[PDB]
Amino acid sequence: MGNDISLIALLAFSTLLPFIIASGTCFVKFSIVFVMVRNALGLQQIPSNMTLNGVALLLSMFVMWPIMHDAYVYFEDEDVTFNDISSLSKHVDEGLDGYRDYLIKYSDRELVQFFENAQLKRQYGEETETVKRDKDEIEKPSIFALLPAYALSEIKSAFKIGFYLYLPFVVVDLVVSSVLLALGMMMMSPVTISTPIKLVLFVALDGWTLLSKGLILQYM
């Protein structure tokens, strides 16, 4: 089975795979957005998390598929000759650049650079003048620097989308409360009147299709 230490490395990677997906792929974002949709509509138990996560997992595959294909053909299909530590190290590293470039496209530079300096640990407490906010790059940061900066960027993006999604439904129910106080009927709660309105508003907008399409379009 080729070199067996390469076999061990393959089985190890295969075991860790779900945590890498859970922390370094746009599944992170799609999973959150759909749950916030349910909260904004105010529903407590339906659709099931089984359904929402199934959808999010499917959609994220379309975005990631182009990268896994290239990594596969680069590593496994091509036979290559290599003979020493340095030649192998370089060969292996060069294969990851297809993924590295995606992370650097969606990660925030000053944070990535901070983590790099933190893991060199050199001369530490280097000042803001050691940086000058440069723009165009041929740097190649570590992946152990790139993963957490990515996670922490995706989460913030999700929260931002969740800000806008709440607004229309917030308007919809303050109007209902004001009309009920224009009548005398202040003893009755809005919620049983307000919920169906939100459901029609959402179907008339066809929000699921606009969401899925627009979420995909960001990564094209």
């Binding site: 089975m1 089985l11 295969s14 075991t15 795979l17 779900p18 997906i21 859970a22 599944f27 089984m50 996560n53 199934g54 997992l57 595959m61 598929w65 182009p66 294909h69 053909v73």
Partner: protein, 89 residues
């Protein structure tokens, strides 16, 4: 001695995810079926089961088969094992 090879077998472009499965599944089921058949008819032939130079080949063929099927099984199980944890959680 009668031998044939099929050469124009595979497409190397990026292709829809549905068909990479069918093509992997089919190519693998074919390879294992023919491998198993050749193993059994190497044992049934009296001129091959009794020659020490031939037995040494059959030993390798059997072991390679064992390992290949063990690995395809292991990786497929870990594949569905990922999905079921991401979804349950």
């Amino acid at each position: 001695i009668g031998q044939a090879v099929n050469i124009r077998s595979m497409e190397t472009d990026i292709v829809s995810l549905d068909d990479r499965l069918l093509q992997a599944f089919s190519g693998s089921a074919i390879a294992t079926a023919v491998d198993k058949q050749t193993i059994t008819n190497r044992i049934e032939d009296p001129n091959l089961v009794t020659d020490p130079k031939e037995l040494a080949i059959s030993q390798e063929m059997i072991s390679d088969y064992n390992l290949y099927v063990s690995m395809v099984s292991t990786l497929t199980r870990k594949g569905v094992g990922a999905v079921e944890t991401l979804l349950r959680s």
